[PDB]
Amino acid sequence: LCSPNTPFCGVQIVANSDTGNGFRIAATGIVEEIDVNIEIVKKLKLVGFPYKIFKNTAFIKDMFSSAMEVARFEGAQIKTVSGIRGEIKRALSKPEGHYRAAFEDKILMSDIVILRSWYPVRVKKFYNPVTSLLLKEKTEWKGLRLTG
Amino acid sequence: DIQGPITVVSGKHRRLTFLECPADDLNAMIDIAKIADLVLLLIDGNFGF
Amino acid sequence: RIVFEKVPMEFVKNFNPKFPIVMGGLLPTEIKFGIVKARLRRHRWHKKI
C-alpha cells in the first residue's frame, strides 16, 4: 500500500530480449485508495427461450435446470432482445426448470428472454517483486508472461 | 575509468555526484529517475531521438 | 555507514559497480500490503490496450 496521490507508471516488458521496437511504458495512473478488500463484479446473463404464449403471459424453458432455481429467482426482472420487460411469476411443477412469466406486451416465439445478473469477482493475490540486481545479467528479469 | 557514483567539488560550497545510468537497463532508468536531481539527456543529433 | 544483516548472497556476488544501489526509507503505510484502487490509463504511445 501507498499514500493516496502517489503517481506510478506501468511496463509490461523489462528484459532486453523482448524489448523490440515499441514503446515500453504501458500504463500511467494515480493511486486513489488503499483497502484490504474490494467488490468487483461481472455481468452474468442467463438465457432462456419461450415455448408457450398467452398474450402477456408466457412459459419459458432452458433458463433454469430445475424448479430449484426458479424459486430463488421468482419475481426477477427479465426482458427480451426486443426490449419487452417481463417477470418470473411462478415455477411450473412439470417439467423441471420451466416457469411462467408475464410480459409488458405479447412476445414472439423467436424472441429470447434474458435475465441480467451480476456475479462477484475476486482480485488475485500475486506479488512478484523485481530483483534485477540479484541476477547475473541484471537485464533479463522475467516473470509471469502475457496471455498472447 | 569511471564506475558508479563519483562525487566532485564544483564550487566553494557546492558538490556534484555523477551517475552514468546503464543505457540498456529499463529498471535503472526508473530508479535513477527517482533519485536524480539533474538529468543530462544525451541525444545523438545525427541519428535523432 | 549503514549495516544490514540477512541480505541475499546473490547481491554480494552479483555486484556490478555500474548499476546503482538506491536505498529509500519506508513510511508505515509502505510496509502494509493490500488492495490498491487507482485510476489507470493506457499510455498514449503504447501500441496495444
Partner: peptide, 19 residues
C-alpha cells in the same frame, strides 16, 4: 538502434479525420 516512429516524431495526437 531503436529509432522513434512517426506517431512519436510528429506528435499529432488525437485529431479528427480531415478530408
Amino acid at each position: 538502434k531503436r529509432a522513434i516512429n512517426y506517431q512519436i516524431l510528429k506528435n499529432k495526437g488525437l485529431t479528427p479525420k480531415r478530408n
